[PDB]
């Protein structure tokens, strides 16, 4: 179906074996539904020790990505990608990634993900080589590899043939019928496909209201959703 | 220093090689600063085909984690962990993970991370086996492996000997002095350690104000921070 090519710039290309060789994403890669090609900036070095880090101007305790190997790696990825590729840099300063943001990034046929290590990359590289800056959350990691793999995994779920709403997911139950005294909701085993659908939607509205109330504020609930929410709030208030 | 043991329940334990064999986290594991031990629920199956998924009550297109292999795997991890271990389940319905949440989870000496596949796990398992439910962001992934690895990587940065603020990070510059016409801020190459510190803090306040304004609202800025923010806002308004 809709093929998706993702170019990756990273000092540890082996980390991406976690998604290219396992689970649903590994199957999407095997079936040529998703192509992940990695470029290591270490291969673009020229000194004897293959230096990929550099000291930052102004002092500072930390280090940065060395510009020349990183910049050359990026240009190589752009050449292989051709035109249309959107270059993305993963950093806490980037745009917060939500499901709506995942759908947007999934609209791209070609993507280039720059994985930064140490204290990040040079600011001038962002202005000249990076199109969009993204963040998977307000937390700091040792590298942009995991956020990159998170992005790739997220957008992969939208590729046609990979698999087979605004609210939190309803509770799910499977065998056995009774687990440590706790029983499965009888409505789920009633066969009433309409009552079951209404139940699941109702529980989704309740869990969203109790756990993530701010998510409901940015939603325009349907007449059915407004009903089930009012019922859930009434039942919660005994 | 402060040792940290993290037990992991996952159908793909090989994915965690991405953090246990590479970069800073891989070094922390090698130096016995961080221990990651994986249990595969597939090893706790008894049928010929090692079934680990089960059909959900009420119909539904998707599948769930089979309770018996998962439950047995969890109990085994608790036995090896001993007392004090906090069991965590990664799911979008969980508490949103921020840097403040990372610090909290880093206070635990022992952790058990349950990685859910398919449409998740049985709700009754969460009530009986899970202590805290967490989310790395408002997006859906093919599994809880990447969120688990994200958590492990995040809390690893707080382990003493692994390495060596509320605001977004300031711009960083390294060699060369001029890159495609763009120059390094002269203040950074002035040597003025006080002016440089004030500059970096000022840029952090400006980037936070322009990109993530909601982050500033939940902050009690110091007198110096209030000054530099007012100056940045004045300079931004020409
Ligand atoms: N929150 C995220 O998406 C994220 C991305 C990367 C990361 N570490 C890489 C990095 C470190 C410092 C500066 C720039 C990038 N941590 C978290
Ligand atoms: N947002 C997260 O932290 C997250 C965690 C897990 C995940 N996929 C695993 C899963 C799928 C369905 C139900 C429960 C867990 N996706 C995202």
From Swiss-Prot, chains A, B:
GO molecular function, one term: tRNA (guanine(37)-N1)-methyltransferase activity
Alphabetized Gene3D superfamilies for the sequence: 3.40.1280.10, tRNA(m1g37)methyltransferase, domain 2 (1.10.1270.20)
Chemical reaction(s) catalysed: guanosine(37) in tRNA + S-adenosyl-L-methionine = N(1)-methylguanosine(37) in tRNA + S-adenosyl-L-homocysteine + H(+)
Annotated residues for binding of S-adenosyl-L-methionine: 89, 116, 136-141
GO cellular component, one term: cytosol
Chief localization: cytoplasm
Keyword Secreted: no
Keyword Secreted: no
EC number assigned by the record: 2.1.1.228
Alphabetically ordered keywords of this record: Cytoplasm, Methyltransferase, S-adenosyl-L-methionine, Transferase, tRNA processing
One of the GO biological process terms: tRNA N1-guanine methylation
Subcellular location: Cytoplasm
PANTHER family: TRNA (GUANINE-N(1)-)-METHYLTRANSFERASE (PTHR46417:SF1)
NCBIfam families membership: PRK00026.1 (NF000648), trmD (TIGR00088)
Similarity comment text for this entry: Belongs to the RNA methyltransferase TrmD family.
Subunit and partners: Homodimer.
Biological role: Specifically methylates guanosine-37 in various tRNAs.
Protein's recorded name: tRNA (guanine-N(1)-)-methyltransferase
Gene label: trmD
């Amino acid at each position: 179906g809709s093929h998706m090519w993702i170019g990756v710039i990273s000092l540890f290309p082996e980390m991406f074996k976690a998604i290219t060789e396992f689970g649903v994403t590994g199957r999407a890669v095997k079936h040529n539904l998703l192509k992940v090609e990695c470029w290591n900036p270490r291969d673009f070095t020229f000194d004897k020790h293959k230096t990929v880090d550099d000291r930052p101007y102004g002092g500072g305790p930390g280090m940065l990505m060395m510009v020349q190997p990183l910049r050359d790696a990026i240009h190589t990825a752009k050449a292989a990608a051709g035109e249309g590729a959107k270059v993305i840099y993963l950093s806490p300063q980037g745009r917060k990634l939500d499901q709506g943001g995942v759908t947007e990034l999934a609209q791209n046929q070609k993507l280039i993900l720059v994985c930064g290590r140490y204290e990040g990359i040079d600011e001038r590289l962002i202005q000249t080589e990076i199109d969009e800056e993204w963040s998977i959350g307000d937390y700091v990691l040792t590298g942009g590899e995991l956020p990159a793999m998170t992005l790739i995994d997220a957008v992969a779920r939208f590729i046609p043939g990979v698999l087979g709403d605004g609210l939190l997911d309803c509770p799910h139950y499977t065998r056995p019928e009774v687990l440590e005294g706790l029983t499965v909701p009888p409505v789920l085993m009633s066969g009433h496909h309409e009552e079951i659908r209404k139940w699941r939607l109702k529980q989704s509205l309740q869990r969203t209201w109790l756990r993530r109330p701010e998510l409901l504020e940015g939603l325009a609930l349907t007449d059915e959703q407004r009903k089930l929410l009012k019922e859930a709030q009434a039942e919660h208030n005994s």
